[PDB]
Design an enzyme around this catalytic site. Structure first.
Site, PDB file in Angstrom:
ATOM      1  N   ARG A   1       0.844  -1.189   0.000  1.00  0.00           N
ATOM      2  CA  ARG A   1       0.000   0.000   0.000  1.00  0.00           C
ATOM      3  C   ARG A   1       0.879   1.239   0.000  1.00  0.00           C
ATOM      4  NH1 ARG A   1      -4.987   1.076   4.255  1.00  0.00           N
ATOM      5  NH2 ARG A   1      -5.669   3.118   3.463  1.00  0.00           N
TER       6      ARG A   1
ATOM      7  N   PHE B   1       1.735  10.277   1.840  1.00  0.00           N
ATOM      8  CA  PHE B   1       1.111   9.963   3.120  1.00  0.00           C
ATOM      9  C   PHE B   1       1.863   8.852   3.846  1.00  0.00           C
ATOM     10  CE2 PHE B   1      -2.060   7.555   5.596  1.00  0.00           C
ATOM     11  CZ  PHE B   1      -2.491   8.538   6.461  1.00  0.00           C
TER      12      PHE B   1
ATOM     13  N   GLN C   1       3.116   1.196   3.085  1.00  0.00           N
ATOM     14  CA  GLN C   1       2.737   0.173   4.048  1.00  0.00           C
ATOM     15  C   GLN C   1       3.248  -1.199   3.628  1.00  0.00           C
ATOM     16  OE1 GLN C   1      -1.406   0.247   5.040  1.00  0.00           O
ATOM     17  NE2 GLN C   1      -1.287  -1.471   6.474  1.00  0.00           N
TER      18      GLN C   1
ATOM     19  N   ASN D   1      -3.010  -0.528  11.985  1.00  0.00           N
ATOM     20  CA  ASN D   1      -4.073  -1.252  12.667  1.00  0.00           C
ATOM     21  C   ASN D   1      -5.405  -0.914  12.008  1.00  0.00           C
ATOM     22  OD1 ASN D   1      -5.113   1.213  13.786  1.00  0.00           O
ATOM     23  ND2 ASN D   1      -3.729   1.028  15.540  1.00  0.00           N
TER      24      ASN D   1
ATOM     25  N   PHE E   1       4.162   0.776   8.720  1.00  0.00           N
ATOM     26  CA  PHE E   1       4.190   1.723   7.620  1.00  0.00           C
ATOM     27  C   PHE E   1       5.180   2.840   7.913  1.00  0.00           C
ATOM     28  CE2 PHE E   1       0.790   3.013  10.464  1.00  0.00           C
ATOM     29  CZ  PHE E   1       1.008   4.362  10.639  1.00  0.00           C
TER      30      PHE E   1
ATOM     31  N   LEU F   1      -3.460  10.737  12.389  1.00  0.00           N
ATOM     32  CA  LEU F   1      -3.119   9.439  12.951  1.00  0.00           C
ATOM     33  C   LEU F   1      -2.608   9.539  14.380  1.00  0.00           C
ATOM     34  CD1 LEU F   1      -1.415   7.759   9.875  1.00  0.00           C
ATOM     35  CD2 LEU F   1      -3.801   7.577  10.656  1.00  0.00           C
TER      36      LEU F   1
ATOM     37  N   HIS G   1      -2.146   5.245  15.720  1.00  0.00           N
ATOM     38  CA  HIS G   1      -1.107   4.266  15.437  1.00  0.00           C
ATOM     39  C   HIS G   1       0.094   4.535  16.331  1.00  0.00           C
ATOM     40  CE1 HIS G   1      -3.429   2.946  12.016  1.00  0.00           C
ATOM     41  NE2 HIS G   1      -3.433   4.173  11.527  1.00  0.00           N
TER      42      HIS G   1
END
Ligand SMILES: O=P(O)(O)O[C@H]1[C@H](OP(=O)(O)O)[C@@H](OP(=O)(O)O)[C@H](OP(=O)(O)O)[C@@H](OP(=O)(O)O)[C@H]1OP(=O)(O)O
Ligand SMILES: [Zn+2]
Lengths: 92, 36, 177, 150, 55, 368, 131, 167, 22
Positions: C55, C60, C63, C102, C113, C122, C126
């Site tokens: 990902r 941003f 992942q 998560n 990530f 976030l 996270h």
């Protein structure tokens, strides 16, 4: 020969310079070394004539330094009188 | 020494808007006109 | 002559050898002992070997950490998703952060990530267990350079070839067989 | 050294202060010729006769025995430039030595001579003044003495 | 580490330190005399004594 | 000069480097609104006239135009420097007057690879490119308003470089880069950072040009003239041209070295009729423009006794004596550059000055 | 000068930087004598400084002249406004390096100025832009 | 927290208090905003005293974090107390403070002279605060009742209202 | 003597030069 004058001149120079200080907002000496007051305004100073750094210490000097006094550059009345008489007689 | 933004401008609002200061040359403010 | 940057000192170091080059991760094992223990052991277990980065969201995050490569997989060393860990001194202000993905609270898996930039949304979500060292930073960013296909999946996803633990803060970690 | 002297002298009222300022600085002594050469030149070169610069040269003599010597020398040094100096500054000098010699910082004169043989019309005026000043103090009678024993 | 007694309003609004630093005079003096020595030695010995940055 | 209103207000600008100081007893250092100027204490008139100077985002305009100028300069040199491409980052709008951190103004992407040396000064000369290698390269442009206490640009440059590079807040794509600082108040420019072949001369020339050129700087300078109401007396100005001597006196101690009269010889005839040559006392000419200080080294004929051919010895001995003279000199007086009349001197000096690697050696297109 | 240049046409182009360098340095000098004259020099050299497509020079003259609008001497200021006028007739509205939003309100207060040449050139320029 | 609550209590949303107690404004202020936002000396005095304590405490905190060293911490503490006039700004609001400032400057001369006597040079590292520390405590002993009375009134005006009568 | 010394600091020519030269 008048000490009272010398005092008065010193305190008064200090009062007008102190007032110009007030003019901006500071009294801080490091922000007004004498170079700003005593520079002939040709170079952008104020051109202040100063008789009051003469000697008890009259006024402060950033360094040892010096300042010239008016009185030294003016010819005394006695001498200019004698000079007058001589000059006229010689002129005739 | 910490730094604090001065963000307040000194522009004279009368002169910025109109273009004429009643105080004339004696104005305590900027007289710079019309900026954004 | 003072320009201050505040952050607690790290502990532990781990090397990730990827198709995008080397990546050095400095871990905080004082702040995040649980997720750093998990990460260190999973690296020692060869669990991250040949695992892609599935990902990539431009600017941003990028992942990875899924052995299945689908993105919904991965598991921790604890036999269950473990707890989240947060700190006011660990925030996302920048790219170069290595954090745990998560689907919710206490959901922490083996997936992690890298931050491609600032994410302020976030925060308190996270856990941040590490950061990438500046010298290796660009290589992390090369993980994020791909032609991205549908559902944020790169066409040629970068992979983690191997793992080296350069400094292990934990005494007791025993890798599983 | 030459520049410091000027600044110390231009700064100070009185003649007393410049010596204090100058001695205080404790500049090297041997130069105690040229310094004084400085004072004699610095005012004499200066536009008109002023009482101050002449007094200073003298005191600087009484304080150390050499300073006196340094002066008498410098008076000698004049012979070479007795002709040469332009006809104003003789007006500063004649008197200016007049005031060292009325107040006793006379016989050093003798070196000076009257001849059409060698006297500079410069020098002519120089000495001319020197008497028309020193007289005006001693008043031509005490001068009668000083000569008569000279 | 010095531990101190504290009175904190049951609300968390304010903590006061409820204590006066009493010392035994000759002991106190001695200890700072010791510190005088130590600090002077430390300044002598370190090559470069880096000082903290404010705040 | 201009032969309850401004004249007071003007008096402040003229002394503003002295009135406002980085070193004061007590003060809270404040940044003027959109600018990079730091006032110490609150001076209303100073504030006002400065805000006149910088208006309509003139600061931002200056930073921008400088950056653009560099962008074009590199856009010309692509081939000679083996640059793959040059991209100007579209600049974060507030980055100019933000003093805590800086992005990268220019990105140079190399065609193949670049051997990069250790960080040194723009005025530095001797470097070793063997330090590292890279591809991406960045350029940052810093504008500060000086004052009386610190007008020194170089220490400022190396400082901001070490800080922004060693900070985690500042974002740079590659550790290899350079930081250029220009002080508007004193019109000074320096740089500190990494280098790669060909970059140093290009940047030197580019800066020396811009400081004479960039319209924004000319708008600043003119606004200063108007606020001060200074107006020059003489038309056409003295003989400035682009000539390097005006910028050459500057702050930097810089010398002229002339060896021509070091080796001189007199010829007379013997009884055979053969013309024979006896050398004579020579001298090394060294001069300083700003002080008028003339170092004249008298070289006695004793140096010429037994050694081979006299010309090359004149050369190498000349460079030697210059080296020893600079050696005995206090550091505050040491030359930043040494310019040479006879290009033949360039080789020995460069060797004999190795003990002082930061001294630039330049030959004269200008005969004197 | 004007006739010489306009006659030379674009054969003059290599000579511009020398010209305008002289034009700015003279554009200071000592005020009342030569300011008006260097200004007028710009005014008559406008078209030549245009058609040859030196844009930097138009930036120069634009903001530099823009700055003198605070000049207290009328006989100068008039020549300044005239120069601005001539610059308007060469480079167009939307391309003005001092965008009109800046310029025009900066002109507006000047109308009190009494002495003549100012009023003349000023009203003229307000006319060109207003039209 | 106190000072932010005061700021919010009055709806001064365009002010910003940072963590080392510098009260800044978010944006350039309108005339009306400037009127309303002024704080008097009571608030500023409080703010600056808090700033001083934050300097102190932070110094200890870095020592505990192992960023510093004992000797460095001691030196920092001495620095702080001698340099209050250049770290804080307390004086701005009370000028009398200069009396403490001068004491601290003198004692720093005195101690530094004796301390740096022999081999030891002009270098940065002298810890020996006890003196400077005393001085601020004496200051605080007196200023406390003043601030209680002034802040008391500030709170009372805030909650009770400025008295209507001006009687 | 900048403004004192002359109306113009610089005028060139060799007119006087090549006249008085001979
Ligand atoms: O030698 P240092 O450890 O660096 O001490 C200096 C210095 O003391 P000395 O010059 O006496 O050695 C300063 O003296 P001056 O430069 O002013 O002569 C003094 O300044 P004060 O006279 O105002 O104390 C200055 O403090 P500051 O930099 O604030 O002026 C102070 O160092 P600190 O700044 O470390 O006190
Ligand atoms: Zn106004």
């Amino acid at each position: 020969n008048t000490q009272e004058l010398l005092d008065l001149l010193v305190k008064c120079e200090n009062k007008i310079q102190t007032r110009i200080k007030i003019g901006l907002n500071s009294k801080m000496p490091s922000r007004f070394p004498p170079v700003v007051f005593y520079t002939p305004k040709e170079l952008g100073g104020l051109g202040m004539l100063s008789m009051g750094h003469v000697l008890r210490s009259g006024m402060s000097h950033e360094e040892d330094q010096l300042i010239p006094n008016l009185y030294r550059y003016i010819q005394p009345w006695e001498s200019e009188f004698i000079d007058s008489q001589r000059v006229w007689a010689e002129y005739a | 020494a910490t730094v604090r933004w001065d963000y307040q401008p000194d522009i004279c609002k009368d002169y910025k808007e109109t273009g004429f200061c009643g105080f004339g040359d004696s104005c305590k403010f900027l007289h710079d006109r019309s900026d954004y | 002559s003072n320009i201050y940057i505040q952050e607690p000192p790290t502990n532990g170091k781990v090397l990730l050898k990827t198709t995008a080059g080397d990546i050095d991760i400095e871990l905080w094992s004082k702040e995040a002992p649980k997720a750093c223990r998990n990460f260190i052991q999973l690296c020692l277990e060869a669990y991250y070997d040949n695992t892609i980065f599935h990902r990539v969201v431009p600017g941003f995050i990028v992942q990875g950490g899924d052995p299945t490569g689908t993105g919904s997989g991965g598991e921790s060393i604890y036999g269950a998703p473990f707890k989240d860990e947060f700190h006011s001194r660990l925030r996302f202000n920048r790219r170069g952060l290595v954090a745990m993905a998560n689907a919710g609270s206490h959901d922490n898996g083996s997936q992690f990530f890298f931050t491609l930039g600032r994410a302020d949304e976030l925060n308190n979500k996270h856990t941040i267990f590490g950061k990438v060292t500046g010298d290796t930073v660009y290589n992390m960013l090369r993980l994020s350079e791909v032609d991205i296909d549908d559902d944020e999946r790169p066409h040629n996803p970068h992979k983690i070839k191997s793992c080296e633990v350069l400094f292990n803060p934990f005494d007791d970690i025993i890798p599983r067989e | 050294f030459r520049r410091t002297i000027y600044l110390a002298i231009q700064s100070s009222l009185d003649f007393e202060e410049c010596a204090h300022k100058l001695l205080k600085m404790e500049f090297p002594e041997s130069q105690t010729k040229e310094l004084c050469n400085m004072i004699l030149d610095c005012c004499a070169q200066q536009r008109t006769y002023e009482k101050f610069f002449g007094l200073l040269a003298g005191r600087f003599c009484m304080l150390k025995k050499e300073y006196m010597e340094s002066f008498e020398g410098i008076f000698k040094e004049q012979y070479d430039t007795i002709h040469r100096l332009e006809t104003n500054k003789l007006r500063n000098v004649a008197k200016m030595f007049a005031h060292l010699l009325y107040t006793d910082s006379w016989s050093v004169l003798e070196c000076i001579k009257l001849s059409e043989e060698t006297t500079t019309s410069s020098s002519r005026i120089f000495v001319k003044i020197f008497f028309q000043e020193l007289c005006e103090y001693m008043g031509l009678p005490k001068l009668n003495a000083r000569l008569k024993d000279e | 580490i010095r531990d101190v007694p504290v009175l904190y309003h049951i609300t968390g609004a304010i903590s006061f330190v409820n204590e006066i630093p009493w010392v035994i005079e000759p002991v106190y003096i001695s200890q700072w005399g010791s510190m005088w020595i130590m600090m002077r030695r430390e300044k002598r010995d370190r090559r470069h004594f880096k000082r903290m940055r404010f705040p | 000069w201009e032969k309850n209103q401004i004249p007071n207000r003007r008096f402040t600008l003229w002394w503003s480097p002295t009135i406002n100081r980085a070193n004061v007893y007590v003060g809270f250092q404040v940044q003027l609104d959109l600018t990079g100027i730091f006032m110490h204490g609150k001076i209303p008139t100073l504030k006002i006239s400065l805000i006149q100077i910088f208006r309509a985002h003139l600061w931002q305009k200056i930073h921008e135009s400088i950056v653009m100028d560099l962008c074009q300069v590199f856009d010309q040199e692509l081939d000679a420097l083996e640059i793959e491409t040059v991209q100007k980052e579209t600049i974060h709008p507030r980055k100019s007057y933000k003093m805590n951190s800086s992005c990268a103004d220019i990105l140079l992407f190399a065609s193949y690879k670049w051997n990069v040396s250790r960080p040194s000064l723009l005025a530095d000369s001797k470097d070793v490119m063997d330090s590292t290698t890279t591809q991406k390269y960045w350029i940052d442009i810093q504008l500060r308003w000086g004052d009386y206490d610190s007008h020194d640009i170089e220490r400022y440059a190396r400082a901001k470089f070490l800080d922004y590079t060693t900070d985690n807040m500042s974002i740079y794509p590659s550790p290899t880069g350079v930081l250029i600082a220009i002080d508007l108040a004193y019109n000074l420019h320096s740089a500190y950072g990494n280098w790669f072949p060909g970059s140093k001369p290009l940047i030197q020339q580019a800066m020396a040009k811009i400081m004479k050129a960039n319209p924004a700087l000319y708008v600043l300078r003119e606004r200063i003239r108007k606020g001060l109401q200074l107006y020059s007396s003489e038309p056409t100005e003295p003989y400035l041209s682009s000539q390097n001597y005006g910028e050459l006196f500057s702050n930097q101690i810089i010398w002229f070295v002339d060896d021509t009269n070091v080796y001189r010889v007199t010829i007379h005839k013997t009884f055979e009729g053969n013309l024979t040559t006896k050398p004579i006392n020579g001298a090394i000419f060294i001069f300083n423009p700003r002080t008028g200080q003339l170092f004249l080294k008298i070289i006695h004929t004793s140096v010429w006794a037994g050694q081979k051919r006299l010309g090359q010895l004149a050369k190498w001995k000349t460079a030697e004596e210059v080296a020893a003279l600079i050696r005995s000199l206090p550091v505050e007086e040491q030359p930043k550059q040494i310019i040479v009349t006879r290009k033949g001197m360039l080789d020995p000096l460069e060797v004999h000055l190795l003990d002082f690697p930061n001294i630039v050696i330049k030959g004269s297109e200008l005969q004197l | 000068f004007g006739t010489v240049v306009n006659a030379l046409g674009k054969r003059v182009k290599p000579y511009l930087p020398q010209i305008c360098g002289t034009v700015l340095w003279r554009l200071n000098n000592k005020s009342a004598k030569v300011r008006q004259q260097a200004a007028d020099l710009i005014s008559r050299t406008a078209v030549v400084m245009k058609t040859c497509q030196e844009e930097k020079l138009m930036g120069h003259l634009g903001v530099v002249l823009y700055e003198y609008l605070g000049e207290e001497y009328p006989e100068v200021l008039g020549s300044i406004l005239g120069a601005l006028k001539a610059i308007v007739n060469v480079i167009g509205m939307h391309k003005m390096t001092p965008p009109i939003k800046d310029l025009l309100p900066r002109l507006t207060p000047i109308l009190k100025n009494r002495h003549e040449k100012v009023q003349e050139n000023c009203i003229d320029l307000v006319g060109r832009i207003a039209d | 927290n106190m000072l932010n609550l005061l700021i919010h209590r009055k709806n001064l949303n365009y002010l910003h208090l940072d963590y080392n107690f510098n009260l800044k404004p978010v944006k350039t202020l309108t005339t009306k905003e400037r009127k309303k936002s002024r704080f008097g000396n009571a608030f500023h005095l409080c703010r600056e005293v808090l700033r001083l304590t934050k300097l102190v405490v932070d110094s200890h905190v870095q020592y505990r974090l192992g960023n510093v060293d004992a000797f460095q911490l001691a030196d920092g503490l001495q620095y702080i107390f001698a340099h209050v006039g250049q770290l804080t700004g307390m004086y701005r609001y009370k000028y009398k403070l200069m009396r403490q400032i001068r004491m601290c400057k003198d004692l720093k001369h005195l101690i530094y002279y004796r301390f740096n006597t022999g081999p030891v040079g002009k270098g940065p590292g002298c810890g020996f605060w006890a003196a400077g520390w005393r001085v601020w405590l004496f200051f605080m002993r007196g200023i406390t009742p003043l601030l209680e009375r002034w802040l008391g009134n500030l709170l009372a005006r805030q909650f009770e209202g400025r008295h209507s009568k001006g009687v | 003597g900048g403004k004192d010394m002359a109306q113009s600091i610089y005028r060139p020519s060799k007119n006087l030069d090549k006249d008085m030269y001979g």
